[PDB]
Amino acid sequence: SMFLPPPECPVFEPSWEEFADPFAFIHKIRPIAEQTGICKVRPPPDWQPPFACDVDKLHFTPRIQRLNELEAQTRVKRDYTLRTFGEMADAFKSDYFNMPVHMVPTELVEKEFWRLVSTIEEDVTVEYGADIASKEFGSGFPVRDGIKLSPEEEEYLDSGWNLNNMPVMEQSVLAHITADICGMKLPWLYVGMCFSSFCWHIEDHWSYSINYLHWGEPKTWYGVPGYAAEQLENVMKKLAPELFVSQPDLLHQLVTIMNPNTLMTHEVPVYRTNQCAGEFVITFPRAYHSGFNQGFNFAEAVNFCTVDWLPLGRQCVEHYRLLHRYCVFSHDEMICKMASKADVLDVVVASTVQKDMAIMIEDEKALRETVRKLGVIDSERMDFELLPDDERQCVKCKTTCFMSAISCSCKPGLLVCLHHVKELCSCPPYKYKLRYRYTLDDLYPMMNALKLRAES
Ligand SMILES: [Mn+2]
Protein backbone atom coordinates (compact mmCIF):
# COMPACT_ATOMS: atom_id res chain seq x y z
CA SER A 1 1.55 -3.45 -0.75
CA MET A 2 0.00 0.00 0.00
CA PHE A 3 1.39 3.36 -1.17
CA LEU A 4 -0.42 6.56 -0.18
CA PRO A 5 0.90 9.13 -2.70
CA PRO A 6 2.15 12.33 -0.95
CA PRO A 7 0.16 15.56 -1.75
CA GLU A 8 1.05 17.43 -4.97
CA CYS A 9 3.80 20.12 -4.87
CA PRO A 10 2.95 23.65 -6.33
CA VAL A 11 2.73 24.08 -10.15
CA PHE A 12 3.47 27.48 -11.67
CA GLU A 13 2.41 28.61 -15.09
CA PRO A 14 4.11 32.02 -15.52
CA SER A 15 3.12 34.43 -18.32
CA TRP A 16 5.94 35.59 -20.62
CA GLU A 17 6.43 38.78 -18.61
CA GLU A 18 6.74 36.70 -15.36
CA PHE A 19 8.91 34.14 -17.20
CA ALA A 20 11.32 36.71 -18.60
CA ASP A 21 13.45 36.94 -15.49
CA PRO A 22 14.10 33.58 -13.83
CA PHE A 23 15.59 35.15 -10.71
CA ALA A 24 12.75 37.66 -10.29
CA PHE A 25 10.30 34.73 -10.86
CA ILE A 26 12.09 32.41 -8.31
CA HIS A 27 12.05 35.26 -5.73
CA LYS A 28 8.27 35.78 -6.42
CA ILE A 29 7.31 32.04 -5.95
CA ARG A 30 9.75 31.54 -2.99
CA PRO A 31 7.18 32.20 -0.10
CA ILE A 32 5.01 29.32 -1.48
CA ALA A 33 7.68 26.95 -2.90
CA GLU A 34 10.04 27.08 0.15
CA GLN A 35 7.14 25.54 2.22
CA THR A 36 7.21 22.46 -0.10
CA GLY A 37 10.93 22.34 -0.97
CA ILE A 38 10.21 21.56 -4.65
CA CYS A 39 7.86 23.12 -7.19
CA LYS A 40 7.13 22.63 -10.88
CA VAL A 41 7.35 25.32 -13.56
CA ARG A 42 5.51 25.08 -16.84
CA PRO A 43 6.98 27.55 -19.30
CA PRO A 44 4.71 29.71 -21.59
CA PRO A 45 3.35 27.42 -24.43
CA ASP A 46 5.52 29.14 -27.11
CA TRP A 47 8.84 28.70 -25.11
CA GLN A 48 10.08 25.55 -26.89
CA PRO A 49 13.90 25.24 -27.06
CA PRO A 50 15.07 23.07 -30.00
CA PHE A 51 16.20 19.57 -29.14
CA ALA A 52 18.44 18.02 -31.83
CA CYS A 53 20.95 15.15 -31.40
CA ASP A 54 22.37 12.12 -33.32
CA VAL A 55 21.52 9.09 -31.14
CA ASP A 56 24.44 7.05 -32.65
CA LYS A 57 27.18 9.62 -31.93
CA LEU A 58 26.16 10.31 -28.27
CA HIS A 59 28.03 7.77 -26.06
CA PHE A 60 28.15 7.35 -22.23
CA THR A 61 29.19 4.88 -19.57
CA PRO A 62 26.13 3.93 -17.49
CA ARG A 63 26.08 3.42 -13.73
CA ILE A 64 24.52 0.17 -12.35
CA GLN A 65 21.89 0.59 -9.63
CA ARG A 66 20.47 -2.00 -7.17
CA LEU A 67 16.96 -0.98 -6.08
CA ASN A 68 16.86 -1.63 -2.30
CA GLU A 69 15.24 0.60 0.31
CA LEU A 70 17.64 1.79 3.08
CA GLU A 71 20.66 0.30 1.21
CA ALA A 72 23.71 2.61 1.10
CA GLN A 73 24.48 4.13 -2.30
CA THR A 74 27.38 6.44 -3.26
CA ARG A 75 26.79 9.98 -4.69
CA VAL A 76 29.35 9.92 -7.57
CA LYS A 77 31.09 12.46 -9.93
CA ARG A 78 29.62 -1.09 -20.47
CA ASP A 79 29.41 1.83 -22.90
CA TYR A 80 26.13 2.68 -24.61
CA THR A 81 25.06 5.02 -27.37
CA LEU A 82 21.85 7.04 -26.67
CA ARG A 83 20.14 4.65 -29.20
CA THR A 84 21.35 1.34 -27.59
CA PHE A 85 20.54 2.68 -24.11
CA GLY A 86 17.02 3.57 -25.31
CA GLU A 87 16.53 0.11 -26.91
CA MET A 88 17.58 -1.55 -23.60
CA ALA A 89 15.45 0.90 -21.53
CA ASP A 90 12.24 0.31 -23.59
CA ALA A 91 12.72 -3.47 -23.81
CA PHE A 92 13.17 -3.51 -19.96
CA LYS A 93 9.92 -1.57 -19.18
CA SER A 94 7.92 -3.40 -21.85
CA ASP A 95 9.11 -6.82 -20.48
CA TYR A 96 8.63 -5.82 -16.84
CA PHE A 97 4.95 -4.98 -17.37
CA ASN A 98 4.15 -7.03 -20.50
CA MET A 99 2.61 -3.85 -21.93
CA PRO A 100 3.61 -1.39 -24.72
CA VAL A 101 6.22 1.06 -23.14
CA HIS A 102 3.77 4.12 -23.31
CA MET A 103 0.71 2.35 -21.93
CA VAL A 104 2.04 1.83 -18.40
CA PRO A 105 0.09 4.16 -15.98
CA THR A 106 2.36 6.46 -13.91
CA GLU A 107 0.51 5.60 -10.64
CA LEU A 108 1.28 1.91 -11.39
CA VAL A 109 5.03 2.53 -12.03
CA GLU A 110 5.10 4.55 -8.72
CA LYS A 111 3.27 1.83 -6.63
CA GLU A 112 5.50 -0.82 -8.26
CA PHE A 113 8.69 1.15 -7.60
CA TRP A 114 7.85 1.28 -3.83
CA ARG A 115 6.88 -2.41 -3.72
CA LEU A 116 10.06 -3.57 -5.60
CA VAL A 117 12.51 -1.49 -3.35
CA SER A 118 10.91 -2.89 -0.15
CA THR A 119 10.74 -6.62 -1.21
CA ILE A 120 13.95 -8.55 -0.28
CA GLU A 121 13.00 -11.34 -2.76
CA GLU A 122 13.21 -8.76 -5.64
CA ASP A 123 16.74 -8.39 -7.14
CA VAL A 124 15.92 -5.69 -9.77
CA THR A 125 18.97 -3.86 -11.21
CA VAL A 126 18.76 -0.80 -13.55
CA GLU A 127 21.21 1.53 -15.39
CA TYR A 128 21.40 5.28 -15.92
CA GLY A 129 23.56 8.01 -17.33
CA ALA A 130 24.93 10.82 -15.14
CA ASP A 131 27.65 13.38 -16.10
CA ILE A 132 28.64 17.04 -16.83
CA ALA A 133 28.49 18.21 -20.50
CA SER A 134 31.50 17.05 -22.66
CA LYS A 135 32.45 16.60 -26.39
CA GLU A 136 31.14 12.95 -26.28
CA PHE A 137 27.80 14.13 -24.74
CA GLY A 138 27.00 17.89 -24.59
CA SER A 139 24.23 20.23 -23.35
CA GLY A 140 20.60 19.67 -24.43
CA PHE A 141 20.35 23.48 -24.74
CA PRO A 142 21.84 25.65 -27.57
CA VAL A 143 25.45 26.84 -26.95
CA ARG A 144 27.87 29.05 -28.96
CA ASP A 145 30.43 27.07 -31.08
CA GLY A 146 33.09 28.23 -33.58
CA ILE A 147 29.18 25.32 -36.05
CA LYS A 148 26.55 27.60 -37.69
CA LEU A 149 23.41 27.83 -35.45
CA SER A 150 19.80 28.19 -36.79
CA PRO A 151 17.70 31.33 -35.77
CA GLU A 152 15.62 28.94 -33.51
CA GLU A 153 18.87 28.00 -31.64
CA GLU A 154 19.93 31.75 -31.54
CA GLU A 155 16.58 32.66 -29.83
CA TYR A 156 17.32 30.26 -26.90
CA LEU A 157 21.10 30.92 -26.70
CA ASP A 158 20.74 33.99 -24.41
CA SER A 159 17.66 32.72 -22.46
CA GLY A 160 17.84 32.87 -18.65
CA TRP A 161 16.14 29.41 -18.64
CA ASN A 162 18.89 27.94 -20.92
CA LEU A 163 20.68 26.12 -18.06
CA ASN A 164 24.17 27.02 -19.48
CA ASN A 165 23.37 30.75 -18.83
CA MET A 166 21.71 30.51 -15.34
CA PRO A 167 25.12 30.36 -13.45
CA VAL A 168 26.72 33.36 -15.27
CA MET A 169 23.72 35.78 -14.83
CA GLU A 170 24.04 39.11 -12.79
CA GLN A 171 21.50 37.94 -10.06
CA SER A 172 23.54 34.71 -9.48
CA VAL A 173 26.28 34.80 -6.75
CA LEU A 174 28.31 31.73 -8.01
CA ALA A 175 29.09 33.70 -11.25
CA HIS A 176 32.16 35.77 -10.23
CA ILE A 177 33.73 32.70 -8.42
CA THR A 178 37.35 32.03 -9.67
CA ALA A 179 37.92 28.55 -8.10
CA ASP A 180 37.51 25.30 -10.12
CA ILE A 181 34.06 24.10 -8.90
CA CYS A 182 33.03 22.08 -12.09
CA GLY A 183 30.18 20.13 -10.39
CA MET A 184 28.46 23.37 -9.15
CA LYS A 185 28.63 25.77 -12.15
CA LEU A 186 28.34 23.27 -15.02
CA PRO A 187 25.11 21.50 -16.01
CA TRP A 188 24.65 17.76 -15.45
CA LEU A 189 23.01 15.48 -18.04
CA TYR A 190 20.83 12.55 -16.92
CA VAL A 191 19.76 9.69 -19.16
CA GLY A 192 17.02 7.75 -17.37
CA MET A 193 15.19 4.44 -17.65
CA CYS A 194 12.26 2.95 -15.76
CA PHE A 195 13.00 2.74 -12.02
CA SER A 196 16.41 4.56 -12.28
CA SER A 197 16.53 6.68 -9.18
CA PHE A 198 18.12 9.50 -7.28
CA CYS A 199 18.39 8.99 -3.51
CA TRP A 200 17.37 11.39 -0.77
CA HIS A 201 19.84 14.32 -0.71
CA ILE A 202 20.32 18.10 -0.47
CA GLU A 203 22.54 20.23 -2.75
CA ASP A 204 26.14 21.05 -1.91
CA HIS A 205 26.36 24.29 0.17
CA TRP A 206 22.50 24.11 0.49
CA SER A 207 22.19 25.57 -3.04
CA TYR A 208 19.13 25.68 -5.28
CA SER A 209 18.81 23.38 -8.24
CA ILE A 210 16.91 23.77 -11.51
CA ASN A 211 16.07 20.68 -13.55
CA TYR A 212 14.70 20.59 -17.09
CA LEU A 213 13.30 17.41 -18.66
CA HIS A 214 14.20 17.77 -22.41
CA TRP A 215 12.22 14.68 -23.60
CA GLY A 216 10.84 11.22 -22.80
CA GLU A 217 8.78 9.68 -20.02
CA PRO A 218 8.12 11.60 -16.80
CA LYS A 219 10.38 11.95 -13.77
CA THR A 220 8.70 11.37 -10.39
CA TRP A 221 9.88 13.65 -7.57
CA TYR A 222 9.49 13.70 -3.76
CA GLY A 223 10.42 16.89 -1.92
CA VAL A 224 10.77 18.03 1.67
CA PRO A 225 10.85 21.74 2.71
CA GLY A 226 14.15 23.16 4.06
CA TYR A 227 12.59 23.73 7.52
CA ALA A 228 12.04 19.93 7.94
CA ALA A 229 15.69 18.99 6.98
CA GLU A 230 16.84 17.95 10.51
CA GLN A 231 13.47 16.25 11.18
CA LEU A 232 14.09 14.09 8.02
CA GLU A 233 17.72 13.38 9.06
CA ASN A 234 16.63 12.27 12.57
CA VAL A 235 14.18 9.77 10.98
CA MET A 236 16.89 8.49 8.59
CA LYS A 237 19.46 8.19 11.47
CA LYS A 238 17.09 5.81 13.38
CA LEU A 239 16.21 3.62 10.35
CA ALA A 240 19.64 3.61 8.56
CA PRO A 241 22.55 4.49 10.99
CA GLU A 242 25.30 3.22 8.59
CA LEU A 243 24.64 6.23 6.26
CA PHE A 244 25.61 8.72 9.01
CA VAL A 245 29.22 7.47 9.68
CA SER A 246 32.25 9.77 8.97
CA GLN A 247 33.40 9.72 5.28
CA PRO A 248 37.05 10.15 4.05
CA ASP A 249 35.97 12.71 1.35
CA LEU A 250 33.10 14.25 -0.73
CA LEU A 251 33.53 11.33 -3.25
CA HIS A 252 32.46 8.89 -0.43
CA GLN A 253 29.01 10.44 0.40
CA LEU A 254 26.34 7.84 1.36
CA VAL A 255 22.69 8.25 0.23
CA THR A 256 19.53 6.05 0.23
CA ILE A 257 16.08 5.20 -1.22
CA MET A 258 13.39 5.66 1.50
CA ASN A 259 9.59 5.50 1.15
CA PRO A 260 7.98 8.98 1.56
CA ASN A 261 5.16 7.23 3.59
CA THR A 262 7.79 6.34 6.26
CA LEU A 263 8.64 10.08 6.46
CA MET A 264 4.91 11.01 6.44
CA THR A 265 4.31 8.54 9.36
CA HIS A 266 7.05 10.42 11.31
CA GLU A 267 5.28 13.81 10.64
CA VAL A 268 7.90 14.95 8.04
CA PRO A 269 6.01 16.98 5.32
CA VAL A 270 6.52 15.35 1.85
CA TYR A 271 5.28 16.57 -1.58
CA ARG A 272 5.32 14.86 -4.98
CA THR A 273 5.22 15.66 -8.71
CA ASN A 274 5.50 13.97 -12.09
CA GLN A 275 7.71 16.25 -14.15
CA CYS A 276 6.93 15.89 -17.85
CA ALA A 277 9.01 16.74 -20.97
CA GLY A 278 9.34 20.54 -21.30
CA GLU A 279 8.82 21.18 -17.59
CA PHE A 280 11.20 22.48 -14.95
CA VAL A 281 11.55 21.39 -11.30
CA ILE A 282 13.19 23.85 -8.90
CA THR A 283 14.55 22.64 -5.51
CA PHE A 284 14.92 25.26 -2.72
CA PRO A 285 17.93 25.54 -0.25
CA ARG A 286 18.31 22.55 2.17
CA ALA A 287 15.18 20.90 0.60
CA TYR A 288 15.57 17.08 0.59
CA HIS A 289 14.56 15.42 -2.67
CA SER A 290 14.52 11.98 -4.30
CA GLY A 291 12.68 10.30 -7.15
CA PHE A 292 12.80 7.86 -10.04
CA ASN A 293 12.21 7.83 -13.79
CA GLN A 294 8.99 6.43 -15.35
CA GLY A 295 10.92 5.34 -18.44
CA PHE A 296 13.51 6.40 -21.04
CA ASN A 297 14.24 10.14 -20.73
CA PHE A 298 16.81 12.94 -20.88
CA ALA A 299 17.25 15.66 -18.29
CA GLU A 300 19.63 18.54 -17.60
CA ALA A 301 20.23 20.16 -14.24
CA VAL A 302 22.31 22.88 -12.60
CA ASN A 303 22.96 24.33 -9.15
CA PHE A 304 22.50 28.03 -8.57
CA CYS A 305 22.80 30.57 -5.78
CA THR A 306 20.66 33.75 -5.37
CA VAL A 307 21.14 36.76 -2.94
CA ASP A 308 18.44 35.15 -0.71
CA TRP A 309 20.74 32.06 -0.37
CA LEU A 310 23.90 34.04 0.86
CA PRO A 311 23.04 33.84 4.68
CA LEU A 312 22.10 30.11 4.28
CA GLY A 313 25.44 29.48 2.49
CA ARG A 314 27.28 30.86 5.56
CA GLN A 315 24.99 28.79 7.92
CA CYS A 316 25.84 25.71 5.74
CA VAL A 317 29.65 26.10 6.08
CA GLU A 318 29.16 26.44 9.91
CA HIS A 319 27.06 23.20 9.76
CA TYR A 320 29.72 21.38 7.62
CA ARG A 321 32.32 22.34 10.27
CA LEU A 322 30.22 20.79 13.11
CA LEU A 323 29.93 17.56 11.05
CA HIS A 324 33.58 17.56 9.74
CA ARG A 325 32.23 17.64 6.16
CA TYR A 326 34.34 18.79 3.22
CA CYS A 327 33.37 22.06 1.46
CA VAL A 328 33.15 22.41 -2.32
CA PHE A 329 34.47 26.00 -2.07
CA SER A 330 35.33 28.64 0.54
CA HIS A 331 32.24 30.84 1.21
CA ASP A 332 34.47 33.64 2.65
CA GLU A 333 36.69 33.54 -0.44
CA MET A 334 33.60 33.97 -2.70
CA ILE A 335 32.45 36.99 -0.55
CA CYS A 336 35.92 38.66 -0.70
CA LYS A 337 36.13 38.01 -4.49
CA MET A 338 32.73 39.77 -4.96
CA ALA A 339 33.92 42.65 -2.64
CA SER A 340 37.04 43.05 -4.87
CA LYS A 341 34.74 43.47 -7.94
CA ALA A 342 32.25 45.84 -6.13
CA ASP A 343 32.35 48.38 -9.06
CA VAL A 344 30.84 45.85 -11.56
CA LEU A 345 28.32 44.06 -9.23
CA ASP A 346 24.54 44.37 -9.47
CA VAL A 347 23.29 46.94 -6.84
CA VAL A 348 21.02 44.40 -4.98
CA VAL A 349 23.91 41.87 -5.05
CA ALA A 350 26.41 44.49 -3.63
CA SER A 351 23.88 45.33 -0.84
CA THR A 352 23.42 41.62 0.15
CA VAL A 353 27.18 40.82 -0.05
CA GLN A 354 27.87 43.85 2.23
CA LYS A 355 25.51 42.37 4.93
CA ASP A 356 27.22 38.91 4.84
CA MET A 357 30.67 40.60 4.83
CA ALA A 358 29.76 42.57 8.03
CA ILE A 359 28.97 39.23 9.82
CA MET A 360 32.18 37.63 8.43
CA ILE A 361 34.31 40.59 9.75
CA GLU A 362 32.72 40.63 13.25
CA ASP A 363 33.06 36.81 13.54
CA GLU A 364 36.71 37.04 12.34
CA LYS A 365 37.57 39.88 14.75
CA ALA A 366 36.20 37.75 17.69
CA LEU A 367 38.09 34.58 16.55
CA ARG A 368 41.43 36.48 16.25
CA GLU A 369 40.97 38.02 19.75
CA THR A 370 40.34 34.50 21.22
CA VAL A 371 43.49 32.99 19.60
CA ARG A 372 45.64 36.00 20.74
CA LYS A 373 44.39 35.19 24.31
CA LEU A 374 45.55 31.53 23.85
CA GLY A 375 49.09 32.89 23.35
CA VAL A 376 49.41 32.88 19.53
CA ILE A 377 51.49 36.05 18.93
CA ASP A 378 53.39 35.55 15.66
CA SER A 379 51.43 36.25 12.45
CA GLU A 380 52.10 36.36 8.69
CA ARG A 381 49.90 37.22 5.72
CA MET A 382 49.07 34.27 3.48
CA ASP A 383 47.31 34.09 0.11
CA PHE A 384 45.05 31.12 0.80
CA GLU A 385 43.36 31.22 -2.64
CA LEU A 386 46.73 30.08 -4.23
CA LEU A 387 46.74 26.82 -2.30
CA PRO A 388 44.98 23.74 -3.76
CA ASP A 389 41.87 22.89 -1.57
CA ASP A 390 43.41 19.69 -0.13
CA GLU A 391 46.31 21.90 1.13
CA ARG A 392 44.12 24.29 3.14
CA GLN A 393 41.66 22.08 5.05
CA CYS A 394 41.43 22.22 8.87
CA VAL A 395 43.05 18.99 10.28
CA LYS A 396 40.07 18.69 12.69
CA CYS A 397 36.83 19.89 11.00
CA LYS A 398 37.99 19.81 7.28
CA THR A 399 36.76 23.37 6.56
CA THR A 400 38.47 25.13 3.60
CA CYS A 401 40.50 27.92 5.21
CA PHE A 402 40.55 31.42 3.71
CA MET A 403 40.31 34.23 6.25
CA SER A 404 42.81 32.64 8.63
CA ALA A 405 44.49 29.49 9.98
CA ILE A 406 47.07 28.36 12.51
CA SER A 407 50.34 26.68 11.58
CA CYS A 408 53.30 25.25 13.50
CA SER A 409 56.79 24.66 12.04
CA CYS A 410 56.75 21.15 13.72
CA LYS A 411 53.96 20.03 11.25
CA PRO A 412 54.83 21.50 7.79
CA GLY A 413 51.85 22.17 5.52
CA LEU A 414 49.25 21.32 8.23
CA LEU A 415 46.62 23.89 9.14
CA VAL A 416 43.84 24.32 11.67
CA CYS A 417 40.97 26.83 11.46
CA LEU A 418 40.64 29.29 14.43
CA HIS A 419 38.01 27.09 16.10
CA HIS A 420 40.55 24.27 16.43
CA VAL A 421 43.75 25.89 17.65
CA LYS A 422 44.23 23.15 20.27
CA GLU A 423 44.07 20.34 17.56
CA LEU A 424 47.32 21.06 15.64
CA CYS A 425 50.17 19.69 17.86
CA SER A 426 51.38 19.59 21.47
CA CYS A 427 53.73 22.69 21.09
CA PRO A 428 52.87 25.73 23.30
CA PRO A 429 50.77 28.28 21.26
CA TYR A 430 53.70 30.84 21.24
CA LYS A 431 55.39 28.49 18.67
CA TYR A 432 52.33 29.01 16.38
CA LYS A 433 51.85 31.44 13.57
CA LEU A 434 48.52 33.04 12.73
CA ARG A 435 48.23 32.96 8.87
CA TYR A 436 45.72 35.54 7.59
CA ARG A 437 44.47 36.71 4.22
CA TYR A 438 43.64 40.29 5.30
CA THR A 439 44.12 42.53 8.29
CA LEU A 440 40.88 44.10 9.71
CA ASP A 441 42.20 47.37 8.13
CA ASP A 442 42.17 45.82 4.62
CA LEU A 443 38.61 44.45 5.17
CA TYR A 444 36.68 47.65 6.17
CA PRO A 445 37.48 49.53 2.82
CA MET A 446 36.40 46.38 0.83
CA MET A 447 33.05 46.46 2.62
CA ASN A 448 32.80 50.29 2.07
CA ALA A 449 33.30 49.78 -1.73
CA LEU A 450 30.18 47.51 -1.62
CA LYS A 451 28.32 50.19 0.41
CA LEU A 452 29.14 52.85 -2.27
CA ARG A 453 28.02 50.51 -5.08
CA ALA A 454 24.82 49.58 -3.16
CA GLU A 455 23.94 53.29 -2.57
CA SER A 456 24.38 54.24 -6.32
MN1 LIG B 1 14.33 -5.16 -3.55
Ligand SMILES: [Mn+2]
Ligand atom coordinates in the same frame (compact mmCIF):
# COMPACT_ATOMS: atom_id res chain seq x y z
MN1 LIG C 1 19.60 17.14 -6.41
Ligand SMILES: [Zn+2]
Ligand atom coordinates in the same frame (compact mmCIF):
# COMPACT_ATOMS: atom_id res chain seq x y z
ZN1 LIG D 1 54.06 22.14 16.83
Ligand SMILES: [Zn+2]
Ligand atom coordinates in the same frame (compact mmCIF):
# COMPACT_ATOMS: atom_id res chain seq x y z
ZN1 LIG E 1 38.48 23.57 12.15
